Design a binder for this molecule. Structure first.
Ligand SMILES: NC(=O)C1=CN([C@@H]2O[C@H](COP(=O)(O)OP(=O)(O)OC[C@H]3O[C@@H](n4cnc5c(N)ncnc54)[C@H](OP(=O)(O)O)[C@@H]3O)[C@@H](O)[C@H]2O)C=CC1
Ligand SMILES: NC(=O)C1=CN([C@@H]2O[C@H](COP(=O)(O)OP(=O)(O)OC[C@H]3O[C@@H](n4cnc5c(N)ncnc54)[C@H](OP(=O)(O)O)[C@@H]3O)[C@@H](O)[C@H]2O)C=CC1
Ligand SMILES: NC(=O)C1=CN([C@@H]2O[C@H](COP(=O)(O)OP(=O)(O)OC[C@H]3O[C@@H](n4cnc5c(N)ncnc54)[C@H](OP(=O)(O)O)[C@@H]3O)[C@@H](O)[C@H]2O)C=CC1
Ligand SMILES: [Mg+2]
Ligand SMILES: [Mg+2]
Lengths: 362, 367
């Protein structure tokens, strides 16, 4: 009954969304976008009988049987043509900002699983949300949890974090870590807690929260996905298994609850500790960058470069936060971006500077 | 500004409500009821400058400075005169059923802190509710918690229980326990927590308040007493409400809803949360729920038998294990009773059950 477009269908969230569609009825998939993974894309288009494809990268997809949009405006033009009830925005990276803006324009509901859009261009997304009235539901497990318990008056919003792959390591050994010791961008971002820094900025945008009302706790066990501390002593917490199909399903079928597998209650350990500034320096850059979309966009651009460089073996793990920090210095005093073009300009300039810094660090 | 009547103002919930009104602005207390505690009633009247009082016991209240109602209809009379924005119904015992019904007739919101009204006459309350459209918000901390996270497609509604004073006791030792074992909240509530009859009442109240089938309710013993309620969703999500064990929290919530009052925020630390199924051998009276849930006759007799048995325990007439036996045997005498249809039908069952439970209690007391 409800029509769906999945942007970034070939990624993790994209394929987990497909899995949900196999498990629950009522949504018809009518289009996808994907970047370069044609082998998986072909498999999707075959299994789901998808007649509309937007290609965002540099590959071919002939098929006279299906409509194929191609180029820098493929997502936007596909969406205009299809006017889906629901768009799952699961594109990775900075291209997520235009993907989200276009989905808000042409869709009745947007399921948001791209972080860059809010980190770099949250003001643009909020402006478009207000103009269009489109429903927006976060897919991120922590924002999904908060969405389910949020109210207008809160003391604090608590986001939880694993602490990443090196949460147990000594401060002294972390600097030297290799991909082998860490392992995927998301995986590296969890280890530096840059992913958690993105989530704080996203929560500020989604829930109109001041920076001061957000708390991050390392939560070893992975059960509590968010909590809301209220003025009266009450705390509303959300617990679930750590499976992204849960918040995917919630954003897709809201206000209905999909029957998956209930989390029946048993005795549990719930630990909450403050992140160590000496272990997670890039995370603690939040206070420096929060008020500036120029700084936030530069923060994201430098992290993209540094993670890629870390993965390629050009720098050690300790080099990530240093690339970010050094790149941010070069954007101090930048005026607040006002348009999409301003944001895209900062982004590309930040990528250039971060690469220069990465070269120095080796 | 909102006007408030507190029915049962001299009791535990009553005084905790008064404490909230001292800490928080926006609600004016214009009327109280009390049963017999004149000392406390007069000092409430003096400290809150209350001009309106209903007496429900056979007591004298000398005052020309203020309006005083007396006799069997004093609550209904005062409420009809005052028409408060909010009535807190904190009367103890069976007379809460009449009180809640009169409160729904003359208030815009009822804050419900009386269990007998829903246990015994929930069908009567639900009918009056849809007639008037009055708001009813539960004050009980478990129901308050569930109220905060409830949604139509819950898989399970989870109520938590301390397990009460004898929770760590061997089953053989439980039968012979004495008041001193249970009492070292209030006396009745403490016993009911020990037998888990208080939880049986809360399950029945949850079914009424939230329109849940009995099969959708689970009760877990929760040693830490941090989680006050949870809902399990069909998708894997579970929404839990945590707070300090302070009744002022849910009292404030019900009075001020949709506003949250600033009290003391609970900040998160490392916690263990335990959830265990109650042992039917340890809490026999709690597991009578499946037998009584569909009958307001059996639920009224359940409540009445409990009232008699708890008092008899506290008076030293029977040991702790005699409480569930008084309840079980009294219920046996009401097997097959027809479903009550009116307030009057309910009150008749209550009276019969009290008298029948008294006889059983004698029997068990004589051994
Ligand atoms: N993974 C998770 O558990 C979570 C992810 N998110 C957010 O979701 C977003 C995507 O996550 P994830 O699914 O893991 O990422 P993946 O890399 O696993 O997949 C993302 C998709 O985006 C496509 N893509 C890549 N580059 C571009 C581009 N330049 N333009 C348009 N599309 C492109 C990829 O295509 P292809 O494979 O063909 O090259 C793929 O289809 C991120 O912002 C992430 O932070 C949020 C919460 C949880
Ligand atoms: O092997 P199966 O025959 O077991 O298919 C399993 C599931 O995939 C679902 N599915 C296939 N295509 C789509 C689509 N385009 N949109 C939503 N669900 C889809 C099927 O739904 P269906 O058979 O209803 O298309 C079915 O529920
Ligand atoms: N206490 C708690 O923590 C909780 C209590 N509840 C429920 O709230 C209700 C009352 O609670 P609680 O305040 O603790 O009880 P209390 O015994 O502390 O107070 C009961 C109040 O009702 C009055 N009263 C006594 N008998 C009668 C009667 N026959 N007719 C009219 N009024 C009478 C009493 O007046 P007086 O003092 O003059 O005799 C007193 O003001 C009960 O249903 C209880 O289960 C629910 C959740 C939590
Ligand atoms: Mg997350
Ligand atoms: Mg309770």
């Amino acid at each position: 009954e409800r029509t769906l477009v999945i942007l970034g269908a070939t990624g993790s969230i994209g394929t987990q969304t497909l899995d949900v569609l196999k498990k629950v009825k009522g949504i018809r998939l009518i289009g996808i976008s994907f970047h370069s993974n044609l082998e998986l894309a072909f498999k999707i288009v075959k299994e789901f009988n998808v007649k509309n494809v937007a290609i965002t990268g540099d590959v071919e997809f002939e098929d006279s049987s299906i409509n194929v949009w191609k180029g820098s405006h493929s997502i936007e033009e596909m969406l205009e043509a299809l006017k889906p009830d629901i768009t799952m925005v699961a594109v990775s990276g900075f291209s997520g900002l235009r993907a989200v803006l276009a989905s808000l324009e042409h869709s009745k509901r947007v399921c948001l699983a791209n972080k860059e859009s809010l980190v770099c261009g949250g003001f643009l997304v909020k402006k478009k949300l207000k103009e269009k009235g489109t429903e927006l539901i976060p897919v991120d497990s922590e924002h999904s949890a908060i969405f389910q318990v949020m109210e207008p008056e809160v003391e604090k919003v608590v986001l939880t974090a694993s602490g990443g792959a090196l949460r147990d390591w000594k401060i002294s050994k972390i600097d030297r870590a290799r991909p082998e010791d860490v392992l995927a961008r998301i995986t590296v971002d969890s280890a530096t807690m840059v992913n958690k820094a993105f989530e704080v900025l996203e929560a500020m945008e989604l829930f109109e929260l001041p920076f001061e009302k957000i708390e991050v706790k390392i939560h070893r066990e992975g059960l509590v996905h968010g909590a809301v501390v209220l003025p009266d002593g009450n705390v509303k917490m959300v617990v679930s298994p750590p499976d992204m199909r849960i918040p995917i399903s919630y954003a897709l079928f809201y206000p209905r609850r999909v029957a998956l597998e209930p989390f029946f209650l048993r005795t549990i350990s719930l630990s909450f500790e403050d992140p160590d500034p000496e272990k997670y320096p890039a995370f603690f850059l939040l206070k420096e960058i929060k008020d500036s979309y120029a700084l936030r966009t530069a923060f994201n651009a430098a992290d993209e470069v540094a993670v890629e460089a870390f993965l390629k073996g050009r720098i050690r793990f300790g080099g990530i936060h240093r690339v970010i920090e050094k790149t941010l210095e070069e954007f101090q005093g930048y005026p607040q971006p006002r348009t999409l073009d301003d944001v895209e300009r900062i982004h590309f300039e930040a990528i250039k500077k971060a690469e220069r810094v990465t070269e120095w660090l080796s």
